Short mmCIF file of C-alpha atoms (C1' of nucleotides) and ligand atoms in Angstrom, two decimals:
data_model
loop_
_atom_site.label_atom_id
_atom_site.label_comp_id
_atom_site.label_asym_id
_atom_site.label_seq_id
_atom_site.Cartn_x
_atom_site.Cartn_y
_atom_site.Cartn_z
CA UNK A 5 228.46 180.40 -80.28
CA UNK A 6 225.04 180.08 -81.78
CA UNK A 7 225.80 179.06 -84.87
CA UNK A 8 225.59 175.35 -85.86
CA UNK A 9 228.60 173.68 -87.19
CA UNK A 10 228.40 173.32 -91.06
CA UNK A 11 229.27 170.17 -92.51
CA UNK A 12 229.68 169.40 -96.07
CA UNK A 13 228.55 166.64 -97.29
CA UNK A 14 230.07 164.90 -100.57
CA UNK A 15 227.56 163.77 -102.87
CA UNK A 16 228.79 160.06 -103.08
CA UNK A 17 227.39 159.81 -99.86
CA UNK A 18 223.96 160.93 -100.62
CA UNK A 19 221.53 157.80 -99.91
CA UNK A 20 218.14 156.88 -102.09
CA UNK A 21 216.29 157.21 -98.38
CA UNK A 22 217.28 160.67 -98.61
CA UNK A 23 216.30 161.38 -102.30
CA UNK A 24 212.89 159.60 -101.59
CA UNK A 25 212.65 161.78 -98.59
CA UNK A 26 212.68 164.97 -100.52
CA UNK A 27 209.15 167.00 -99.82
CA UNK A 28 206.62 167.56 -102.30
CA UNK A 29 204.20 169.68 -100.89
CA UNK A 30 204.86 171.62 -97.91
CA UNK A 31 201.52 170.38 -96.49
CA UNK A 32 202.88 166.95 -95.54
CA UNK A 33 206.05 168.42 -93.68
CA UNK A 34 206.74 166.34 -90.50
CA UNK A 35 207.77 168.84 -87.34
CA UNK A 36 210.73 167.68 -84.96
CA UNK A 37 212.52 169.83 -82.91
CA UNK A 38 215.08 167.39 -81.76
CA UNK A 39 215.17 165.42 -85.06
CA UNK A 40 214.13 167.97 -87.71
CA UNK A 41 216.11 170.38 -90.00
CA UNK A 42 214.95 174.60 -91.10
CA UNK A 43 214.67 175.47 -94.20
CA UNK A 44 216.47 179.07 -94.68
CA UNK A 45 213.37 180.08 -97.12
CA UNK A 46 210.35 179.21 -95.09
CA UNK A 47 211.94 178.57 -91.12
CA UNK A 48 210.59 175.26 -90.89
CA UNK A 49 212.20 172.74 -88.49
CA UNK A 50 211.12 169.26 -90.27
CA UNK A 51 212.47 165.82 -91.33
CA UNK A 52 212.11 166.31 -94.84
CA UNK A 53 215.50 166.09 -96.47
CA UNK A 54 216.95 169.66 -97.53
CA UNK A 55 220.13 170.84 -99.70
CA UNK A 56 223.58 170.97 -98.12
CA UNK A 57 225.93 173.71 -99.69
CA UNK A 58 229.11 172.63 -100.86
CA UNK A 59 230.72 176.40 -100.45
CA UNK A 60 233.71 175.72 -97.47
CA UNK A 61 232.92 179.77 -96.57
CA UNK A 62 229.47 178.78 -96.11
CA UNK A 63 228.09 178.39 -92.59
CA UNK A 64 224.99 177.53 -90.65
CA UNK A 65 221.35 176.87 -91.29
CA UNK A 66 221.40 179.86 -94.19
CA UNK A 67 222.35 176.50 -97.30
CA UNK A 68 219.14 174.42 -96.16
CA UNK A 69 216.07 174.59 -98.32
CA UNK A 70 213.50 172.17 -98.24
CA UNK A 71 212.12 170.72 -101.96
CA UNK A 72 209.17 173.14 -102.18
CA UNK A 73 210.64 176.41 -101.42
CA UNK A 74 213.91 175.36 -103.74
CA UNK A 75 211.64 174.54 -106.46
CA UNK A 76 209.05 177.50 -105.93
CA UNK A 77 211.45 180.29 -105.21
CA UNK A 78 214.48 179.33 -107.60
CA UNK A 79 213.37 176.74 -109.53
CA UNK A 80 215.92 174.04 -108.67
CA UNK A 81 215.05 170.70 -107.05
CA UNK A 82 216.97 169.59 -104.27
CA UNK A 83 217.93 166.23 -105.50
CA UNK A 84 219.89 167.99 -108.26
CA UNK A 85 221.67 170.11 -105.92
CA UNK A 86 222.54 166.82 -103.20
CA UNK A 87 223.87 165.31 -106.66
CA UNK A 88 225.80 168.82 -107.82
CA UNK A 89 229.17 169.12 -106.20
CA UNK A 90 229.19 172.26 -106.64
CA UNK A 91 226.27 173.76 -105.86
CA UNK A 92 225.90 176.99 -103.87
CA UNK A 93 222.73 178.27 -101.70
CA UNK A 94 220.90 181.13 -103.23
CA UNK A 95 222.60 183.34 -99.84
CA UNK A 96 225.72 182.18 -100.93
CA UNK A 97 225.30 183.00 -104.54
CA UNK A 98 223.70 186.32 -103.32
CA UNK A 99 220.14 185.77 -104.89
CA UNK A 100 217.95 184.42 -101.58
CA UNK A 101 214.71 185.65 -102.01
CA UNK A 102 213.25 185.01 -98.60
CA UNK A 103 211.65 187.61 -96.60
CA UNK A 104 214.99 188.34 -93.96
CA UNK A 105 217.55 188.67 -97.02
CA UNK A 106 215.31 190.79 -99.29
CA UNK A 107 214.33 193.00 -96.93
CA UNK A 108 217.81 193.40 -95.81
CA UNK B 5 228.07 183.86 -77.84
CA UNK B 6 231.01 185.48 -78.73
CA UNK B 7 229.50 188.67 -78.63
CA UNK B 8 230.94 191.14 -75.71
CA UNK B 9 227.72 193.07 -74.10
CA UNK B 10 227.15 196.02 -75.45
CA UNK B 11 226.21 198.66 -72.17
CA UNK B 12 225.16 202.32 -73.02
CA UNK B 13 226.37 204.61 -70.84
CA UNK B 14 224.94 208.16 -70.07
CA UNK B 15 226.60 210.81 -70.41
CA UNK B 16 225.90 211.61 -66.79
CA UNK B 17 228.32 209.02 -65.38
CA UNK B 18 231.48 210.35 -67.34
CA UNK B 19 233.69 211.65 -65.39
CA UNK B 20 236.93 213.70 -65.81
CA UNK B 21 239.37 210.87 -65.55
CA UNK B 22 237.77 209.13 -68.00
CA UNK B 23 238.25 212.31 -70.23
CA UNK B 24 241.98 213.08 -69.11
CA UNK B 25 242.53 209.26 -69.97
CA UNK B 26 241.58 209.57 -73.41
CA UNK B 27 244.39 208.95 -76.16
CA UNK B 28 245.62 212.05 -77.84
CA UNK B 29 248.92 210.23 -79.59
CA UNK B 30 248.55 206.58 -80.23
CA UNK B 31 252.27 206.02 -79.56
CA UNK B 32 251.39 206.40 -75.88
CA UNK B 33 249.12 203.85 -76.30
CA UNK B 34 249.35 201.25 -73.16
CA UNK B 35 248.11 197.58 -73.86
CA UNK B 36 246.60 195.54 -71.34
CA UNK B 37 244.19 192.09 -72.54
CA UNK B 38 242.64 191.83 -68.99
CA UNK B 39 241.70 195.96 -68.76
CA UNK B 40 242.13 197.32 -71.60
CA UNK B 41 239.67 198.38 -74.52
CA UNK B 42 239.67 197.92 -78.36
CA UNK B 43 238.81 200.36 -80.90
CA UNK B 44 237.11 199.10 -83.63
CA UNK B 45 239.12 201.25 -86.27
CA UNK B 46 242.87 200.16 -85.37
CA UNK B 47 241.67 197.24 -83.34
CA UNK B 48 244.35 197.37 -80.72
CA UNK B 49 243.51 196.45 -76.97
CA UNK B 50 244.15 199.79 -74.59
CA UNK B 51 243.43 201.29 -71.62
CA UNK B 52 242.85 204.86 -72.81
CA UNK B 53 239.45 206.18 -73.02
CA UNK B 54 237.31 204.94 -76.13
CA UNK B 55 233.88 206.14 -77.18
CA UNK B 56 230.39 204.41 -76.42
CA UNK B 57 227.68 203.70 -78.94
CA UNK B 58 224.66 205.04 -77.70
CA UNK B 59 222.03 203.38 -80.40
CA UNK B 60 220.27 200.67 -78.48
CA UNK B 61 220.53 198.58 -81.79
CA UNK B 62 224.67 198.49 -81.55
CA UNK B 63 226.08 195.30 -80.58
CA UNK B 64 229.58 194.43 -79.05
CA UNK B 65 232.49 196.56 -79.23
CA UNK B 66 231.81 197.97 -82.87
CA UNK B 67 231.15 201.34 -81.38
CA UNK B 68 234.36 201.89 -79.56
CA UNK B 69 236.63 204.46 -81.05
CA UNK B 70 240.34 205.74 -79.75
CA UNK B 71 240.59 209.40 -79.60
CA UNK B 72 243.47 209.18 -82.78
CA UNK B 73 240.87 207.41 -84.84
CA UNK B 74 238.11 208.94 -84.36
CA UNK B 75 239.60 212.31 -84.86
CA UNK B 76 241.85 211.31 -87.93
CA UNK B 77 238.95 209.50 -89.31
CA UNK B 78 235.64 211.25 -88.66
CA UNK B 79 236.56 214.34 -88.01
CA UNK B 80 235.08 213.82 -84.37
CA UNK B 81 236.11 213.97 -80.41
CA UNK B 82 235.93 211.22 -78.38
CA UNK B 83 235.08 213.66 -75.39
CA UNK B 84 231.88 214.97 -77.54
CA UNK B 85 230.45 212.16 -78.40
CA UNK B 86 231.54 210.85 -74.47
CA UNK B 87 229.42 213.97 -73.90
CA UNK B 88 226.56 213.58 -76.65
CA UNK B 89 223.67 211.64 -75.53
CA UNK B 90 222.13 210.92 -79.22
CA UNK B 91 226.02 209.80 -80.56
CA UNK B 92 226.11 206.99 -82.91
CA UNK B 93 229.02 204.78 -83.87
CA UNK B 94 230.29 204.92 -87.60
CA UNK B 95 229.39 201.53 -88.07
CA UNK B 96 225.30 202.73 -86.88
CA UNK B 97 225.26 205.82 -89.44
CA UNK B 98 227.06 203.25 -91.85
CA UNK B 99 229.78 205.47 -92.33
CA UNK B 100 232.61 203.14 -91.27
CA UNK B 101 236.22 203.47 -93.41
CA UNK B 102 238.02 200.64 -91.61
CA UNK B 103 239.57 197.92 -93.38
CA UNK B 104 237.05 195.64 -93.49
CA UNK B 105 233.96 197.61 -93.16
CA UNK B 106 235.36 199.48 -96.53
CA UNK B 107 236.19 196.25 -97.60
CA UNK B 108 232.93 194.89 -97.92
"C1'" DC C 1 190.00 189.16 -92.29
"C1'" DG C 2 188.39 184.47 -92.91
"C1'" DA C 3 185.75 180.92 -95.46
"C1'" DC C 4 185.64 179.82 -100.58
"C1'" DG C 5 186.63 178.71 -105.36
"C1'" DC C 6 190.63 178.30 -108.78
"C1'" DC C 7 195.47 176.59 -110.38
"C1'" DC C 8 200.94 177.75 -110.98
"C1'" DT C 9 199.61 173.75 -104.05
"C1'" DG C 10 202.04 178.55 -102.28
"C1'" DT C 11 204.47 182.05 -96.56
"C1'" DC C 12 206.02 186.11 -93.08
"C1'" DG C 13 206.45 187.83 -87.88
"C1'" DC C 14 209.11 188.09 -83.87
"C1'" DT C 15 212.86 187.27 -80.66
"C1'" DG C 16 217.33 187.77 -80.15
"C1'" DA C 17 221.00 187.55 -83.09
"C1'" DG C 18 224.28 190.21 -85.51
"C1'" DA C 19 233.59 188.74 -82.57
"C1'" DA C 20 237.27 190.42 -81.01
"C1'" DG C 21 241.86 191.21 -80.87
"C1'" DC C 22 246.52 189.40 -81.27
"C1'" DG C 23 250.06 189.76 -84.85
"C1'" DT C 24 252.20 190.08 -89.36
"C1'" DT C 25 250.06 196.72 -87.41
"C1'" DT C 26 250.90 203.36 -88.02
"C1'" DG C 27 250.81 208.96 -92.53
"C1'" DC C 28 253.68 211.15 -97.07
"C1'" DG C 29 257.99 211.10 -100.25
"C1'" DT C 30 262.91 209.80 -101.71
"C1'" DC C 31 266.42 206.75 -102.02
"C1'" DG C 32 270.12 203.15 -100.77
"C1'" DC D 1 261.45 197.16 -98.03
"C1'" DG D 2 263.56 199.67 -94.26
"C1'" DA D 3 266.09 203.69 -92.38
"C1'" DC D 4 265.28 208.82 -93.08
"C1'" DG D 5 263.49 213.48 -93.43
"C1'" DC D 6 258.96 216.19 -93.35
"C1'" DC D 7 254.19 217.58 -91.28
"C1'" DC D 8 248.61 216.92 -91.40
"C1'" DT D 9 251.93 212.19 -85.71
"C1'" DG D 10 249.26 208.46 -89.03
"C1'" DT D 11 247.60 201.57 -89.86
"C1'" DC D 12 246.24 196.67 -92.12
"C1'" DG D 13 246.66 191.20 -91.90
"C1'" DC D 14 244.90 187.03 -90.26
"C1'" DT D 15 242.07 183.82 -87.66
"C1'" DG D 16 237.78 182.53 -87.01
"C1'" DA D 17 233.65 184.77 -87.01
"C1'" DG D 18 229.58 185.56 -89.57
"C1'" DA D 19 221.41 182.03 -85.29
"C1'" DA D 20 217.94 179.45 -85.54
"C1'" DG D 21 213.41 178.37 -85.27
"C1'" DC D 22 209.08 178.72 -82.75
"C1'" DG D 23 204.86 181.37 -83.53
"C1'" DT D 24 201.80 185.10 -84.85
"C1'" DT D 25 203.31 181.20 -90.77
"C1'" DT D 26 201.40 179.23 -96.91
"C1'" DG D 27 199.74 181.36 -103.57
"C1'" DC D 28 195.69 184.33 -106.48
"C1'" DG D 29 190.86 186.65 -106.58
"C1'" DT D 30 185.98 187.74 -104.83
"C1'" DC D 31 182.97 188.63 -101.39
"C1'" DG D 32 180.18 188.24 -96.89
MG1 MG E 201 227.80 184.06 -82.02
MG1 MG E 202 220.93 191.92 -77.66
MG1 MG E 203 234.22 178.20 -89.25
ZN1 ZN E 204 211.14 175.82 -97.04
ZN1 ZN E 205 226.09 178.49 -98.75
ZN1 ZN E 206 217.58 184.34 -97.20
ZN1 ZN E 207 241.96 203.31 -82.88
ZN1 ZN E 208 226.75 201.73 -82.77
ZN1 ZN E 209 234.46 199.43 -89.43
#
DNA sequence: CGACGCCCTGTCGCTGAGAAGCGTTTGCGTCG
DNA sequence: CGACGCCCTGTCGCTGAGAAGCGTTTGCGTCG
């Protein structure tokens, strides 16, 4: 299998080093291919922390979205969706924007 | 991967037992796991004959059809399209009425 | 097309990826 | 729902499956 395991991730677990770690501008990303997590929207593989969706049929990279391209492309910010317990990705939902679902 | 290779093969290499060994009553059906074949519309594992996806793009075993099936559902031969070097699966022209491909 | 100046500080391409098959599985109608 | 008789000899459920990320990647307009 290629597919990584999805784990959810309940938000009384969520830490303030997490929240603080939240990017706001994709300029100051942080590359790391062993440590680093891809953003579904922009296929980015960086330490910045990045949404984890709470739907059990979910699976994947395809819930990750780094602060920037939440809050550009759907106008959410990732520290509200770490805090919602029931939030959905945009895929999930059926509304990702990114170049790979839209063009699909 | 849990993908099964998908290997086109031309029309040149069928031979006539291939095409005597293709199902014309799926009661007669025989099962094997180790040798036999699924088709993708009843998804049962046999040894009869079963059609091969020639679109480069097709994947796995979604373009193998059983003689009943393909007949009863398409309207088609499995020893044409054995026998057409342009033939595309259902699934490729996107004209698939299985279960779950007219389920989604 | 790449510097170059603005404000709303941003994004797509390409490769290889995209289940399979056992279990509970076989059309229609009538009827007990 | 399962035998039971016809003709056009047939089919779905469920589990687990359903990429990810490096490379060629960052908005708009004008203009050289
Ligand atoms: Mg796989
Ligand atoms: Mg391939
Ligand atoms: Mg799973
Ligand atoms: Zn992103
Ligand atoms: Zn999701
Ligand atoms: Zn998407
Ligand atoms: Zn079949
Ligand atoms: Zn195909
Ligand atoms: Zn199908």
């Amino acid at each position: 299998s290629m597919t990584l395991p999805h784990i959810i991730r309940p938000v009384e677990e969520v830490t303030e080093e997490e929240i603080r770690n939240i990017c706001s501008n994709s300029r100051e990303k942080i590359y790391n291919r062993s440590l680093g997590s891809t953003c579904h929207q922009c296929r980015q593989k960086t330490t910045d922390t990045k949404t984890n969706c709470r739907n059990p049929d979910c699976w994947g990279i395809r819930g990750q979205f780094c602060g920037p391209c939440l809050r550009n492309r759907y106008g959410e910010e990732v520290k509200d969706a770490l805090l919602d317990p029931n939030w959905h990705c945009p895929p999930c939902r059926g509304i990702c924007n990114c170049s790979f679902c839209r063009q699909r």
